[PDB]
Amino acid sequence: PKFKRLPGHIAIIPDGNRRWALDRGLEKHEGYKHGIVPGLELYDICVKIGIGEVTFFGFTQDNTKRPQIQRKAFVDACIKSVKELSKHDAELLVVGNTNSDMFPKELLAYTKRTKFGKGKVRINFLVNYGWYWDLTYAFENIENIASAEIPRIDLLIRWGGRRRLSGMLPVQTVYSDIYVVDEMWPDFKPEHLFNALEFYQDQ
Amino acid sequence: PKFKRLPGHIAIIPDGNRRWALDRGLEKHEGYKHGIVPGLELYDICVKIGIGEVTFFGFTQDNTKRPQIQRKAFVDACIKSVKELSKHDAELLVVGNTNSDMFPKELLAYTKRTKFGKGKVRINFLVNYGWYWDLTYAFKKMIENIASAEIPRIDLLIRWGGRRRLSGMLPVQTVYSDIYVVDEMWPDFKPEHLFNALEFYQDQ
């Protein structure tokens, strides 16, 4: 799959895990564990076609107020995802509010950017993230927002059909092209990514 | 057209003016004036359906780096838009960087929210707006003191001309806005574009 122009940095909102699960007659929370392989496959594809940088929207400060069994499933999915990717030649950064009981302690090793393997691509995760916490971070210590190490996003791709930004990195998405996949994130398909890329290269 | 629900606050990016002009065989800068009447049409529909507040994306600091001839034209069209809306039942606020040779003097008067006729709808226009200028204005709860502070949260952003982007529109107020893209260029505005956006917003 050959492309006139590619984005330097792709933002991913991996939504639709709960609907995917109910839709299969599973419990809401059971969908998140099916989100991990989609993420590794997107990572593989990005390495092969040469996407420099990928940011995943993990979970916000508000998402922690969801039922416990959901929160634990989606937290556990983000941890598995970072551990797995660290096994596979990723430069990893986790941005989120570490000053919170809801920051998962297993990811404190990744709050400063860490080369793993040949460091093929920069992968960022928003984990216990909040746009308001991100922006106000600067008064307390705009080059200085929480998410300052995450650069401008060229293309944001959202699964699960909703057409909102959900407070993902307000500063870095000011001029980003947005593509919405209707399918749920666990139903990820290479062509979803390629269709976003076809769309991007035309802009 | 019966609605169970409406957005409180609609945001309009009236894009496509140049491509529409080129497509008619005009110069690029001649599209913007074909953008004025559509705006006054959108407002009349908002007033008649009960939309409370509409914010128009006029132009940004970035947009002024374009050639003299385009800048003059989209500034004139914005000035004419605001003057025309002043004749309606609208509470008008212009927001943007007034410490600039690029802010038109004729819109300074509108930088305080001003009720005309019966003030049936709040219209905000962004004129010499920049997202960086907006966030840094707070110079801690300083997000409540950004330049666009008088412009509340956006429920629905509707962009004409097929592009799915914010072009730096109100990063704070758009954090969770629903987004509807209309492929047709802004001067090809039809009531069906607004109705389709609101049906999408409600059926959500």
HEC assignment per residue over chain A:
CCCCCCCCEEEEECCCHHHHHHHCCCCHHHHHHHHHHHHHHHHHHHHHHCCCEEEEEEEECHHHHCCHHHHHHHHHHHHHHHHHHHCCCEEEEEECCCCCCCCCHHHHHHCCCEECCCCCEEEEEEEEECHHHHHHHHHHCCCCCCCCCCCCCCEEEECCCCCCCCCCCCCCCCCCEEEECCCCHHHCCHHHHHHHHHHHHHC
The CA-based dihedral angle spanning residues A5, B167, B170, B74, taken in that order and rounded to the nearest 10 degrees = 170
Phi, psi of B3 (to 5 degrees): -120, 135
Structural tokens at position B62: 């970035």
Method: X-ray
Q: Across the A/B interface, how many CB contacts are shorter than 8 Å?
A: 61
Q: What CATH homologous superfamily does B9-203 map to?
A: Decaprenyl diphosphate synthase-like (3.40.1180.10)
Largest CA distance in chain A: 48
The CA-based dihedral angle spanning residues B33, B186, B147, B127, taken in that order and rounded to the nearest 10 degrees = -10
Q: Say what the resolution is, in angstroms.
A: 2.5
- Considering only CB atoms, which chain B residues are within 8 Å of A135? 135, 143, 172
A155: closest chain B residue by CA? B165
Q: Are A196 and A154 in contact (CB under 8 A)?
A: no
How far apart are alpha carbons A99 and B52 in whole angstroms? Answer: 39
Closest residue to B171, CB basis, from A162, A171, A203: A171
Closest residue to A175, CB basis, from B140, B165, B175: B165
Structural tokens at position B22: 């080129």
Task: List, as one string, the DSSP characters of B15-34.
Answer: --HHHHHHHHT--GGGSGGG
Cβ of B171 within 8 Å of Cβ of A173? The answer is yes
Selecting from 3.80.10.10, 3.40.50.150, 3.40.1180.10, 3.40.50.2000, what CATH number does the domain A9-202 have?
A: 3.40.1180.10
* Residue numbering of the annotated binding site of A for Mg(2+): 15
How far apart are alpha carbons A59 and B12 in whole angstroms? Answer: 29
Is the torsion defined by CA of B20, B86, B78, B43 positive or negative? negative
Cβ of A165 within 8 Å of Cβ of B180? The answer is no
Closest residue to B168, CB basis, from A140, A174, A203: A174
